[PDB]
Design a protein around this ligand. Sequence first.
Ligand SMILES: [Mg+2]
Ligand SMILES: [Mg+2]
Lengths: 302, 297, 301, 291
Amino acid sequence: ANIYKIDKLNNFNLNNHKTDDYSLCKDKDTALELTQKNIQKIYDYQQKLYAEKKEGLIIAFQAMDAAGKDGTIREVLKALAPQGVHEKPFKSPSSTELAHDYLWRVHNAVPEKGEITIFNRSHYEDVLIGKVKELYKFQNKADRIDENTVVDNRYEDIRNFEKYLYNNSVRIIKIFLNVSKKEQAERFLSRIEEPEKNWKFSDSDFEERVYWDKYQQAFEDAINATSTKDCPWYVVPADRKWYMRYVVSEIVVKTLEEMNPKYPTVTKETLERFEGYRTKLLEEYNYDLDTIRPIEKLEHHH
Amino acid sequence: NIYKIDKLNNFNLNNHKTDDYSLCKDKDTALELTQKNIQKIYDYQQKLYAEKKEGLIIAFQAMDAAGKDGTIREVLKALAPQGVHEKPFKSPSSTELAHDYLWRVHNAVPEKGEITIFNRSHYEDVLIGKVKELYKFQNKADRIDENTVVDNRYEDIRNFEKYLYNNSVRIIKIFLNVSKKEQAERFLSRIEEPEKNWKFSDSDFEERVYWDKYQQAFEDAINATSTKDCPWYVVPADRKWYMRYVVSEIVVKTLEEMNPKYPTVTKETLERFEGYRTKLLEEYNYDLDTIRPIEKL
Amino acid sequence: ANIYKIDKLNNFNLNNHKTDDYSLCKDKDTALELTQKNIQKIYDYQQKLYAEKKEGLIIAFQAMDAAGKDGTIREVLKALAPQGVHEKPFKSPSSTELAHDYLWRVHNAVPEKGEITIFNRSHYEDVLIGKVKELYKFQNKADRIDENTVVDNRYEDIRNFEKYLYNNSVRIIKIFLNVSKKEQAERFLSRIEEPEKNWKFSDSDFEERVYWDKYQQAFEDAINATSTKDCPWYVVPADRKWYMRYVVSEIVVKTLEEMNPKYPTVTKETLERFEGYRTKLLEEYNYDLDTIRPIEKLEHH
Amino acid sequence: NIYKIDKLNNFNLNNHKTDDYSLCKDKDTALELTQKNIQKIYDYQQKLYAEKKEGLIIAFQAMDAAGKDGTIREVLKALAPQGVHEKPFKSPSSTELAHDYLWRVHNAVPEKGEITIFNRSHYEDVLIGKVKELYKFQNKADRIDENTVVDNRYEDIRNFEKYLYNNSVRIIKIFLNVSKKEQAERFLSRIEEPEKNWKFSDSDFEERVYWDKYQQAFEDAINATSTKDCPWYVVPADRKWYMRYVVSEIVVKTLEEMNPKYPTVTKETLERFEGYRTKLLEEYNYDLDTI
Ligand SMILES: [Mg+2]
Ligand SMILES: [Mg+2]
């Protein structure tokens, strides 16, 4: 029972989850090395997952600007080999995406069995900025859609979507990077003061600060309404980058371990065909190949 | 409607005969009524497209030669091409099987203001998928319990269709209920007319062996997923003229509940519009056709 | 059509193509009837095209606002059955579409063999509004892209793309609906004055009128640079709606007729299996089916 | 150099040996140089992603067990996940066959600022497509002349790749040139190690019968589609360490010609930014970490 894992409905108080907790590993150097170990194991699990083609994984990060989503995705999951991997940032919806229903663009990006898709922001956008700014009141919708129940029905629909995925061999890790307002300001200052990060800063990043408290409430309500055993939320303290990377590497490793991927074994009958192909290849080259069965090699002429 | 099912666990297939014609016994009457329904469907579609508020899926699920393509063609050829997609769900590709079963369906959901026609549907996964137990041969995670795969699909389908309803997309579900003898007559016709040979295949004939199991799978699907907001319509399919009539009635009545209207523009837009009108009139010295009086300053 | 078909490079003078020509059929009632005939034949060709699964067709309409694109697509092509048909309006590109290359969203919408896709506007937007407003100067691109060869390279690339399609069993009909500025103004007035058309008018429709002459020159240059025998341009006078509908029905019919679709005939071997299935079905029902060969029924009972 | 082909009709396969190692004969040296190249690739990728001006396709085309997956994995696992897609072109689906052959390729072309890796490519349609003459059995229009189908594909591919170039997308084309006996040793290894069985199939073995025809089809493709802007790289594939080294050099050298930079902001944005900085400082009692 992680102190950071939320696995039941209506069981979540945001004020109790401090942004600068570090209780799993107080020493930074220790955490950096444990993080390198976790990364090795992630890469190993990914190769087994890709080979088996049985289960898919979404790793979804949801948080305020400069909480640490891109830096964490980059530092922890750059371990992954390119095969089977997609990263999908959910930006402001296009005209076409708004003309469809809100889970249409999300479901499209769900991974294949054997593959991993990383979500930078997610379908939770529609009960975060969507609830705070009440965007549903300005968007086109049928007159029979009752505005007072739009948000409640998104919590239901999100629960049902995530459980649909679970039942069809796609897991989702949901990660809230819980950063404080002052730490966000320090990181914005850093985006302004360092040339190589200027591109990352925009007007509306600054202007969303005015809605800080409403966003905090909307995270609290979302996590209360969509945490289950099969689709838990993880609330990760985000004020220290080294710690936050450590904790995300732990969550990813532990989920891959429950999924327990293995290189597939081939059937009895395929194995027999395979032995026939082995003999043919060996005969083509008069047993001059590197077999791991040395005794048969000594049998044949040269 | 004797043909609408709008509640769970309320459906007996044996009571829904394939040759019922109780709504309209005279063929020539039904052909006339079908033409009026078609004109109204065209009118509603122009309003639905202009308003961009609600989407419609029209889904047809039935055995081979029940009448899906002939009905879609005769009833919905009235539709203008704008905002219209037709999507036949064939056997899944590799990529579709590597994704989850609703992935390819959700991708074809229409935009608000649009109509998408489904020839076969997500219901494939509790019909041929239940009868041939395809889930046992497909790749899936070890933790997936095979004994509950079908019940979980009924739940997930109900929840998916209610999600769509809540986000401005309706679905009409139509089961064309054809008898096995009538299927055989239509297959014979696909064999004996050159211009229909292309439509006949080996596996169409071979699926007849599974007739009864498919009938049970339709019964179970309709028991498990009929709701007020997402009803099933069980349409007798033994006569083409009757079946086209009934489908025209269902489509027209759904579009009328949706009640699309050309949008009215705000008072402020109307004022800018007047400014544009005066400019145009002045550019051409009042030598345009207007239906409204000209006031000058 | 034929005084209106352009099938050669650098062979196009827009001033010789009047917006109100009506020389193919001067009588409106005649043209309405000929249009209904063409429409039946289009539907018949479409069913054979769909059954054969050998060739695809793009029907692309490019023109100024209220030239008549939507109402022509609606009145002439609503004959088509829904199967195998898509309509794709090219609006201003999304973020994602701008981040990709300009033909990416067009090629995505190319139809399958046996199918018809209608383009309302097209890839030609990138040498029309794209040339007129020089949008390429503000868009993201690599430093090595030379700005004053961007448009010439689009003409080359468009020719090459269209020839690529032709070689892979997809034809394109390109139709320019050539409307006058005055007639556009009358139709805008009608969009403002009639309740049911208000939705169709926007601010920027009016403001683009200031660029009218530049747009006309850009259509001239495009047609000069991309008309070929296999990918011709059709310049259709658009000032009268009945005439424009008639002429477009003729272009679509004549193209479907060159494509010459046929219901496929099955191989000798498939025909024999089919006869075995026929006997089986007949036996299942002791010959009480509607065969086209009733003499065989006399043997049985 | 010896390995880059950048002109039409200038390519003799018999002169490009599978076990050449002339760029770096010492394996340990090549492993070290490979680590340096990989760090530089990561740095370039971050700048390419930030600038959103140019896209990069890295396409690998070769026989089974030439080394495509293991090279892609060992060299490009350095890359961060952001802006990266890997796309294997397997046998076309019935929907992909109902479209034209470049349709599924063009769909996967990357956005500006992004990198897409192709395992196999559009060249499939003049390799297995030429060798097995698949075009004769596929649906097409009656007017398509079968005797010119392949030459029109060379033209169309040249024009497609030139189109991409002109719209900010480069393609690296890499042929991993493996010998038949080395393929057999790697297939043997896929059969003898349980952990690799999944990688082996019946049809991998059966394609060997067409080895010579496939060699001729790679020769013809490289003759027909090598240009200055879209060159081919013929990389000897018989040793994995050497092949990974050379591919890291090609990717690095291409990123360096593209020359991505973190974008510079305008004078006016810099000033707004100063205003935001003072505000943030004032909101907190000047209590923030700054230079
Ligand atoms: Mg990586
Ligand atoms: Mg129609």
